[PDB]
Amino acid sequence: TVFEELKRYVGWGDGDERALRSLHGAAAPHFPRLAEEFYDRILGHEGARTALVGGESQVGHLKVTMIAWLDELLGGPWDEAYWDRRYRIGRVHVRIGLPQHYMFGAMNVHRTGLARLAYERFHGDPPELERVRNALGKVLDLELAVMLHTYR
Amino acid sequence: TVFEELKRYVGWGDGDERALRSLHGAAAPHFPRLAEEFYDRILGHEGARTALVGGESQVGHLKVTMIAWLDELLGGPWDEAYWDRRYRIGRVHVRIGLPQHYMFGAMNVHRTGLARLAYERFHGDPPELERVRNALGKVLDLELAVMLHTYR
Numbered sequence: 001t002v003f004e005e006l007k008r009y010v011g012w013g014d015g016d017e018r019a020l021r022s023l024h025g026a027a028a029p030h031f032p033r034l035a036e037e038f039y040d041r042i043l044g045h046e047g048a049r050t051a052l053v054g055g056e057s058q059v060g061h062l063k064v065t066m067i068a069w070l071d072e073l074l075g076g077p078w079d080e081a082y083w084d085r086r087y088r089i090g091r092v093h094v095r096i097g098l099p100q101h102y103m104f105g106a107m108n109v110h111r112t113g114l115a116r117l118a119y120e121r122f123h124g125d126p127p128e129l130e131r132v133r134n135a136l137g138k139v140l141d142l143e144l145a146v147m148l149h150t151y152r
Numbered sequence: 153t154v155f156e157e158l159k160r161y162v163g164w165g166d167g168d169e170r171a172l173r174s175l176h177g178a179a180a181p182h183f184p185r186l187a188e189e190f191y192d193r194i195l196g197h198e199g200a201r202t203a204l205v206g207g208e209s210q211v212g213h214l215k216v217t218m219i220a221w222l223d224e225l226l227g228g229p230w231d232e233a234y235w236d237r238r239y240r241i242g243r244v245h246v247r248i249g250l251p252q253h254y255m256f257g258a259m260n261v262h263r264t265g266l267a268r269l270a271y272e273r274f275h276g277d278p279p280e281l282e283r284v285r286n287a288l289g290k291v292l293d294l295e296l297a298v299m300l301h302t303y304r
């Protein structure tokens with residue numbers, strides 16, 4: 001019952017779902033750049049770069065799937081079907097033997113870029129920036145929770 | 153070496169340490185409120201609440217160590233001794249049999265309250281808010297990384 005238990009813990013509601021869909025509007029034009037920053041960080045890092053051995057075409061294909069990951073992250077819905085898909089995504093990284101600690105590093109790159117886009121779009125309406133900032137934190141902490149469940 | 157590999161991944165530097173120290177002075181007066189918010193979430197959650205059956209003194213003592221936990225989070229330093237203390241804290245929770253996913257729910261409560269406090273203090277200086285918000289996301293993500301290393 002992991003996503004169900006944590007939605008309750010963090011106070012997930014319709015309000016968070018609206019806020020993320022508002023953020024999708026602002027962020028989606030920038031998904032290619034966020035994917036770019038994400039693989040740049042992996043390819044810049046001595047330990048993490050050893051996970052990516054398929055070459056020039058592999059990063060191109062992973063950028064395509066990361067763009068779709070982002071699009072689902074912000075657009076939803078965030079029902080059982082969505083979270084079961086996130087479980088399988090966790091298991092993929094488990095099966096390639098990626099060390100779990102890299103998942104927190106990688107999610108931090110998305111967290112930082114997405115927090116920046118949110119500020120840039122919503123700073124003029126502080127109460128909507130707060131709703132959007134709060135939802136973003138929740139969805140990213142639940143993604144980490146679900147992906148790290150698969151490592152157990 | 154979770155802390156050291158991951159610190160390079162997220163770009164942890166002297167500037168993150170300065171941003172968090174700057175927030176400390178603003179946020180410290182609110183640590184009692186944050187601690188209250190943290191415990192009220194545990195007590196309102198059907199699964200998590202059963203870990204607090206040691207009475208009003210158990211909750212009172214946990215509040216004290218949580219205010220110390222927050223003071224260290226934002227005050228530092230973030231050295232080998234710090235991160236060793238964080239491993240030990242992680243192990244406490246493994247030892248008492250707390251489901252690992254609750255660590256993500258609980259951390260989200262602090263992330264939400266601390267992100268509001270950073271905005272409140274730094275929103276008249278958007279480049280400083282940027283540094284503080286980035287440092288806060290990093291430190292919480294590293295904390296989760298170390299905590300969940302202990303659950304392996």
Ligand code: HEM
Nearest residue numbers: 042048049051052065066069089092096098102103106107
């Ligand atoms: C926020 C963190 C991450 C997310 C959201 C993420 C997401 C994804 C997604 C959606 C897929 C496609 C799975 C499928 O085919 O359906 C995937 C595959 C993959 N990811 Fe990640 N990933 C993350 C972290 C990492 C990291 C840190 C690395 C390496 C440093 C990595 C390397 C890979 C590789 C190599 C594959 C392909 C595996 C294979 O097909 O053999 N990922 N990831």
Ligand code: HEM
Nearest residue numbers: 194200201203204217218221241244248250254255258259
């Ligand atoms: C961000 C998440 C959390 C942090 C930072 C945190 C921090 C701490 C700290 C610093 C201690 C003190 C260890 C010591 O006395 O040396 C502790 C103990 C404890 N925590 Fe947490 N904690 C978290 C999540 C949780 C959750 C979700 C629960 C329960 C639902 C919980 C229940 C406890 C209990 C029962 C103890 C005391 C165990 C004993 O009697 O020895 N904590 N925590």
Ligand SMILES: [C-]#N
Nearest residue numbers: 062063065066
């Ligand atoms: C992972 N791409």
Ligand SMILES: [C-]#N
Nearest residue numbers: 214215217218
């Ligand atoms: C745990 N307090």
Ligand SMILES: [Cl-]
Nearest residue numbers: 119133271285
């Ligand atoms: Cl903000």
